[PDB]
Amino acid sequence: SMKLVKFRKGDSVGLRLAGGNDVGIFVAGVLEDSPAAKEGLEEGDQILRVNNVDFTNIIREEAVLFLLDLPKGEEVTILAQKGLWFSDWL
Amino acid sequence: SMKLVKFRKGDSVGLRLAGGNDVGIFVAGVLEDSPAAKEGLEEGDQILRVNNVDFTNIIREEAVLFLLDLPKGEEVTILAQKGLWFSDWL
């Protein structure tokens, strides 16, 4: 049900995000060959926490900038849960 | 603002979908090297119409099954608009 994903940030975090009208922040894509991919992050997962931030109470714009601004080399810890729905490949 | 994407369906349509609580059906991924990719479908686009179906008034489950069930070789026409938000790669 929950998953803890930990990787060292490279030049980018290797993720894209999606959400709606304050209904949670979701993984909308994981970069191929990235540390995030290697460690098991998946499209459709809800992000609950990144490092010391509650990702269930953050506005969209901050969620984006927080991840962009983490320095290269720093460890990123994501707690994810496996409002939005996502289909499989069709 | 709008885009019309037309391709011949292969073994799969080459797309994944996302939505919320009846807030529209969105492109959540486009398969690399697919006809859909070649013709310009992009993650974050809202699907307005597929063939002769109003994709703004269809429940999630039908949206999925409709696309799965289209036969191989049939032309797929998607009208897309460039409730959900999607970030860029971070």
Query: B85–A23: do the CB atoms touch at under 8 Å?
Result: no
Q: Is A69 on the interface with B (CB under 8 A)?
A: no
Beta bridge partners of A78: A5, A50
Mutate to test the interface with A, among B27, B59, B78, B90 (most CBs of A within 10 A): B90
Q: Are A81 and A2 in contact (CB under 8 A)?
A: yes
Query: B67–A90: do the CB atoms touch at under 8 Å?
Result: yes
Query: How many angstroms away from the CA of B76 is the closest CA of chain A?
Result: 13
> How far is C-alpha A21 from the geometric centre of its chain's CA atoms?
18
How buried is A51 (Cβ within 10 angstroms: 0-12 exposed, 13-18 middle, 19+ buried)?
A: middle
How far apart are alpha carbons B26 and B20 in whole angstroms? Answer: 10
Nominal resolution (angstroms): 1.5
Query: How many angstroms away from the CA of B86 is the closest CA of chain A?
Result: 4
In chain A, which residues are last before a break of more than 2.5 Å from C to the next N?
82
Position A10, amino acid: G
Neighbours of A67 (CB within 10 A): 25
Q: How many CA atoms lie within 13 A of A52 on its CB side?
A: 1
All domains in chain A, ordered by first residue = 1-90 (2.30.42.10)
Q: Which residue has the tokens 């969620």?
A: A63
How far apart are alpha carbons A55 and A58 in whole angstroms? Answer: 5
Query: B83–A21: do the CB atoms touch at under 8 Å?
Result: yes
Tokens of A31: 């970069």
Q: Are A10 and A72 in contact (CB under 8 A)?
A: yes
Closest CA to A63 of A71, A55, A75: A55
Q: Is B15 on the interface with A (CB under 8 A)?
A: yes
Please tell me the experimental approach by which this structure was elucidated. Answer: X-ray
Q: Are B67 and B30 in contact (CB under 8 A)?
A: no
How far apart are alpha carbons B7 and B76 in whole angstroms? Answer: 5
